[PDB]
Design a protein around this ligand. Structure first.
Ligand SMILES: *CCC(=O)Nc1ccccc1Nc1nc(Nc2ccc(N3CCN(C)CC3)cc2)ncc1Cl
Length: 279
């Protein structure tokens, strides 16, 4: 199941991020990443093998994870200029691959694994930004209200997070940036029913799926198995998800007003391909 580390053949080079400490390395001519009693639980969970989950490959103690050239979704969406251009197909593809990884964890025997902290900073991008990989593990903006309400929670809390992420890559906005302040202000907001503003000209199938994920009552949210199928079938109307991110962008963000917001991506081509099939 596991490959052992001697440290000698792990050639550390440069530092990555500060969210523990993370460093890039080379191990058997493979770019790889590396990082207190929490690993005891990680032994039982590390039976994972999925394309959309970071491949989990001891003095000091180290966890060896495959390196993701492309950084985090969060940094692609909101990071330092220059920011890349991307399309509706990218946004849908990222979310689809996200739900494929989350469904895998939900289907693990003997018991399902809930990710809990599903958010763009833990979604990594590979192969020119086209492949998303969950990095298993201020989260208020993506947390289902029943979780920080303390009450026991199911795996529907990831469905909630996925819904928020879908709004996030479509609009290229940080959810609940208008509220901000300390975390408890956002928790109070979403607990009372506040949700990201709905999106101008969004396709009703997508609006319907997104808002179902946002439901207060977790039992009214869809399973991730259902997410995956919906998103799989929708991709027929979003060609282009394998095109690398390479084109620049100078991102202008208008204020929100009249209770709605405009998307970043453009669905024009979706309404075109849809009407070709539907009459
Ligand atoms: C498993 C969750 C986790 O640890 N996520 C995380 C968060 C921050 C930094 C590293 C990291 N883990 C991994 N990172 C990579 N590759 C990678 C991450 C981040 C960057 N950028 C940092 C911000 N800069 C502005 C740009 C570069 C680059 C590369 N790969 C694997 C893991 Cl596990």
């Amino acid at each position: 199941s596991l490959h052992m580390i001697d440290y000698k053949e792990i050639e550390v080079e440069e530092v990555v991020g500060r969210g523990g400490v993370v460093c890039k390395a080379k191990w058997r001519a493979k770019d790889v990443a590396i990082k207190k009693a929490f690993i005891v639980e990680l032994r039982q969970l590390s039976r994972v093998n999925h394309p959309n989950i970071v491949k989990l490959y001891l003095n000091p103690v180290c966890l060896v994870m495959e390196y993701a050239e492309g950084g985090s979704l969060y940094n692609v969406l909101h990071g330092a200029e220059p920011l890349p251009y991307y399309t509706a197909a990218h946004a849908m593809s990222w979310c689809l691959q996200c739900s494929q990884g989350v469904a895998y964890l939900h289907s693990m025997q003997p018991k399902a694994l809930i990710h809990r902290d599903l958010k763009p900073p833990n979604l990594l991008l590979v192969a020119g930004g086209t492949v998303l990989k969950i990095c298993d593990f201020g989260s208020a903006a993506w947390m289902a209200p029943e979780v920080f309400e303390g009450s026991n929670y199911s795996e529907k809390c990831d469905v909630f997070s996925w819904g928020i992420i879908l709004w996030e890559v479509i609009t290229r906005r940080k959810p609940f940036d208008e509220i901000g302040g300390p975390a408890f202000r956002i928790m109070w907001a979403v607990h009372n029913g506040t949700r990201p503003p709905l999106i101008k000209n969004l396709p009703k199938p997508i609006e319907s799926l997104m808002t179902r994920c946002w439901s207060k009552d977790p039992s009214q949210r869809p399973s991730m198995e259902e997410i995956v199928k919906i998103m799989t079938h929708l991709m027929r109307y979003f060609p282009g998800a394998d095109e690398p991110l390479q084109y620049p962008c100078q991102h202008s963000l208008p204020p929100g007003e009249d209770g709605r917001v405009e998307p970043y991506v453009d669905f024009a081509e979706f309404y075109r391909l849809w009407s070709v099939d539907h009459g």
